[PDB]
Design a binder for this molecule. Structure first.
Ligand SMILES: CCCCCCCCCCCC[N+](C)(C)[O-]
Lengths: 131, 131
């Protein structure tokens, strides 16, 4: 498996399993998570979640006590072992009850070491479904 | 329509019409086209095709003698009006009836003037089909 595919697959696994230290272990010190790209509830100023401290902070307040499910519908390798794209379905479940789901394209970049430098999501709240 | 969506649709129109100057007019002077991301036939050194002079040369090489079609299977807005992703199928025909086809994720970014700064493709020669 390419470094990008390993990292993205390991990323989904840690998040779903609520593995804080495993998730952060996948990340470069200079990581930027734009989920989604542009201004949204999960990217308030559009500049993304920047650095492992911020990423852990996000996990703590927004993943720790919430159920998240990630379904990979399709994977698109590039001609670089370090860059990859996927069609993912994100399903979130807050206690007690409120659900949201969104389907979008997600891009990942890793550095030479195989650590995630970028995760970028193409979706918006107009595309989201609620229950 | 968003600037990103407008620019991407216009890119498809220009390339299919062999409109070299119209295509270049959609681009920022700092444009980088990575089709695909990473080293390949259409990205010789993996650093992409950089700037309008180089893009014009790329057009002369890979588009001017290509019966090229672009089919948009699906579009994925982000939360930025300036960034968007699509699943595209690019069908080429060249030199006496050779045909190639690739289906992949293509991301586009525009600047504040709505001009394309980045076009990036997730595909590799291994996912290409022929005839
Ligand atoms: C079998 C190898 C042939 C190389 C594939 C043909 C290159 C076509 C490039 C068409 C232009 C693509 N794009 C994204 C700029 O529109």
């Amino acid at each position: 498996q390419s470094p990008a595919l390993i990292a993205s697959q390991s990323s989904w696994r840690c998040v779903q399993a609520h593995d804080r230290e495993g998730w952060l272990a996948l990340m470069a010190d200079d990581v930027v998570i734009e989920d989604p790209i542009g201004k949204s509830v999960t990217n308030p100023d559009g500049s993304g979640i920047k650095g492992k401290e911020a990423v852990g902070a996000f996990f703590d307040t927004h993943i720790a006590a919430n159920r998240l499910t990630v379904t990979c519908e399709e994977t698109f390798p590039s001609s670089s072992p370090d860059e990859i794209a996927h069609i993912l379905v994100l399903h979130s479940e807050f206690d007690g009850g409120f659900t949201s789901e969104v389907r979008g394209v997600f891009t990942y970049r890793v550095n030479k070491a195989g650590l995630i430098t970028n995760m970028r999501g193409y979706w918006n709240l107009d595309m989201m479904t609620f229950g």
